Enzyme design. Structure first.
Site, PDB file in Angstrom:
ATOM      1  N   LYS A  27       1.300  -3.851   8.962  1.00 30.46           N
ATOM      2  CA  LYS A  27       2.314  -2.833   9.023  1.00 30.46           C
ATOM      3  C   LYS A  27       3.581  -3.425   9.655  1.00 30.46           C
ATOM      4  O   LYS A  27       3.600  -3.743  10.879  1.00 30.46           O
ATOM      5  CB  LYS A  27       1.754  -1.681   9.860  1.00 30.46           C
ATOM      6  CG  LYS A  27       2.747  -0.594  10.216  1.00 30.46           C
ATOM      7  CD  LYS A  27       2.135   0.390  11.194  1.00 30.46           C
ATOM      8  CE  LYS A  27       2.968   1.635  11.335  1.00 30.46           C
ATOM      9  NZ  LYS A  27       2.342   2.594  12.265  1.00 30.46           N
TER      10      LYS A  27
ATOM     11  N   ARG B 215       4.839   3.019   2.143  1.00 28.85           N
ATOM     12  CA  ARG B 215       6.002   2.893   2.989  1.00 28.85           C
ATOM     13  C   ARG B 215       6.261   4.257   3.630  1.00 28.85           C
ATOM     14  O   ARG B 215       5.722   5.265   3.210  1.00 28.85           O
ATOM     15  CB  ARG B 215       7.212   2.411   2.177  1.00 28.85           C
TER      16      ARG B 215
ATOM     17  N   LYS C 156       9.436   6.052   6.807  1.00 31.24           N
ATOM     18  CA  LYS C 156      10.722   5.924   7.504  1.00 31.24           C
ATOM     19  C   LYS C 156      10.642   4.876   8.628  1.00 31.24           C
ATOM     20  O   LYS C 156      11.681   4.339   9.039  1.00 31.24           O
ATOM     21  CB  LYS C 156      11.134   7.292   8.058  1.00 31.24           C
ATOM     22  N   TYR C 157       9.415   4.572   9.095  1.00 26.70           N
ATOM     23  CA  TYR C 157       9.152   3.772  10.312  1.00 26.70           C
ATOM     24  C   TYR C 157       8.507   2.396  10.019  1.00 26.70           C
ATOM     25  O   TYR C 157       8.612   1.487  10.863  1.00 26.70           O
ATOM     26  CB  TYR C 157       8.278   4.585  11.274  1.00 26.70           C
ATOM     27  N   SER C 158       7.906   2.203   8.836  1.00 28.11           N
ATOM     28  CA  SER C 158       7.242   0.913   8.477  1.00 28.11           C
ATOM     29  C   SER C 158       7.022   0.753   6.963  1.00 28.11           C
ATOM     30  O   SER C 158       7.183   1.708   6.207  1.00 28.11           O
ATOM     31  CB  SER C 158       5.926   0.824   9.192  1.00 28.11           C
ATOM     32  OG  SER C 158       5.102   1.889   8.780  1.00 28.11           O
TER      33      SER C 158
ATOM     34  N   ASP D  73       1.643  13.613  14.381  1.00 29.93           N
ATOM     35  CA  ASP D  73       1.958  13.378  12.968  1.00 29.93           C
ATOM     36  C   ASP D  73       0.685  13.502  12.111  1.00 29.93           C
ATOM     37  O   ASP D  73       0.489  12.740  11.167  1.00 29.93           O
ATOM     38  CB  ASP D  73       2.640  12.038  12.711  1.00 29.93           C
ATOM     39  CG  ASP D  73       3.463  11.997  11.409  1.00 29.93           C
ATOM     40  OD1 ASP D  73       3.648  13.009  10.772  1.00 29.93           O
ATOM     41  OD2 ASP D  73       3.841  10.878  10.983  1.00 29.93           O
TER      42      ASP D  73
ATOM     43  N   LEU E  76       0.825  -1.183   0.000  1.00 27.80           N
ATOM     44  CA  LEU E  76       0.000   0.000   0.000  1.00 27.80           C
ATOM     45  C   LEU E  76       0.879   1.260   0.000  1.00 27.80           C
ATOM     46  O   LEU E  76       0.474   2.282  -0.553  1.00 27.80           O
ATOM     47  CB  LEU E  76      -0.919  -0.005   1.232  1.00 27.80           C
ATOM     48  CG  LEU E  76      -2.049  -1.039   1.233  1.00 27.80           C
ATOM     49  CD1 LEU E  76      -2.811  -1.065   2.548  1.00 27.80           C
ATOM     50  CD2 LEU E  76      -3.039  -0.797   0.124  1.00 27.80           C
TER      51      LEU E  76
END
Ligand SMILES: C=Cc1cc(O)cc2nc(-c3ccc(O)c(F)c3)oc12
Length: 321
Positions: A62, A41, A43-45, A148, A39
């Protein structure tokens, strides 16, 4: 500085609620999930559409890229689960080969915001902003800052008129007087407080980010404040909100302004929000929209509307009706 609302939420609850380092996830087997489509991307997943092969339910998986940060996300999602328009966490799993931790969520059939924001009516913007406020009033009421908020983290199924606030990986518990890392949000949605290294921020940070979204939606300039780097982001803000207004903010809270700003900030008058109207966006703008926006995009985090206050604004009368 202190949050004007929900300040003592966490202290009044059991330590277990907010002591996320003590939380112990139970890591199940990701081999129950077929990850059929990538789906997105970050920086974290990385995020996949998936099927639970045991019961054929559609979900999102995720895959996460320190344990403390994982525990934080998991505990927050559990605390918030059931909340209006909060993404629903279904399970915590690990791939048996890689051992990498992953979170399973409900699936929402998102309409990409670049395509969507182009075809929203005035009413649609009010509708979705109201729904996102429900999520924020909820999570703030639960002692949690999202930190965020941005279009990418607001999933909208335009057909079913469903909204979920996603990616709670930067979320934190609010505790009065605590100093937080300013390396949160995404550049265009960073509140002034983050840009001047002011650490004693609160839920109000999310309301700045929401204001940024609202400006982009009604004015069709996306993103609204398009900084090249963290320094320039504040310059972009100051060209609209004004520089003398910024210095007033810094003085009130005794914030040290990085000396580099003196070379680039310039001298800018506060701009009227009416300055942003043109023939392409007039049909999304109203006096009510501008009154709300002016009360969200304020330097002074304490003076910004709370989620609840925003929900009572005339902009949302049609949606409540
Ligand atoms: C990436 C696009 C995307 C598209 C879509 O149809 C559904 C999604 N759900 C997530 C998601 C949910 C929870 C998270 O914490 C997260 F980071 C992402 O991302 C999604």
């Amino acid at each position: 500085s202190r949050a004007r609302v929900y300040a003592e939420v966490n202290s009044l609850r059991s330590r277990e609620y907010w002591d996320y380092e003590a939380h112990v996830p139970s890591w199940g087997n990701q081999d129950d999930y077929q990850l059929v489509r990538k789906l997105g991307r970050g920086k974290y997943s990385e995020v996949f559409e998936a099927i639970n092969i045991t019961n054929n339910e559609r979900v999102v998986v995720k895959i996460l890229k320190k344990k403390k940060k994982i525990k934080r996300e998991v505990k927050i999602l559990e605390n918030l689960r059931g909340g209006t328009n909060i993404i629903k966490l279904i399970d915590t799993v690990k791939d048996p080969v890689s051992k990498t931790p992953a979170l399973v969520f409900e699936y929402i059939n998102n309409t990409d915001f670049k395509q969507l924001y182009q075809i929203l009516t005035d009413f649609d913007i009010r509708f979705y902003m109201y729904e996102l406020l429900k999520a924020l009033d909820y999570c703030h009421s639960k002692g949690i800052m999202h930190r965020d908020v941005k279009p990418h983290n607001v999933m909208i199924d335009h057909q079913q008129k469903k909204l979920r606030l996603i990616d709670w990986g930067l979320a934190e518990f609010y505790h009065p007087a605590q100093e937080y890392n300013v390396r949160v949000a995404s550049r265009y949605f960073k509140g002034p407080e983050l840009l001047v290294d002011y650490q004693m921020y609160d839920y109000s940070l999310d309301m700045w980010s929401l204001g940024c979204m609202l400006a982009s939606m009604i004015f069709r300039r996306e993103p609204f404040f398009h900084g090249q780097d963290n320094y320039d982001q504040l310059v972009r803000i100051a060209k609209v909100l004004g520089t003398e207004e910024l210095y007033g903010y810094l003085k009130k809270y005794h914030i040290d302004l990085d000396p580099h700003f003196n070379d680039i900030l310039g001298q800018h008058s506060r701009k009227r929000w009416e300055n942003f109207i043109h023939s392409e966006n007039r049909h999304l703008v109203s006096p009510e929209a501008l009154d709300l926006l002016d009360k969200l995009l304020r330097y002074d985090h304490q003076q910004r509307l709370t989620a609840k206050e925003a929900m009572e604004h005339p902009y949302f009368y049609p949606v409540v009706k």
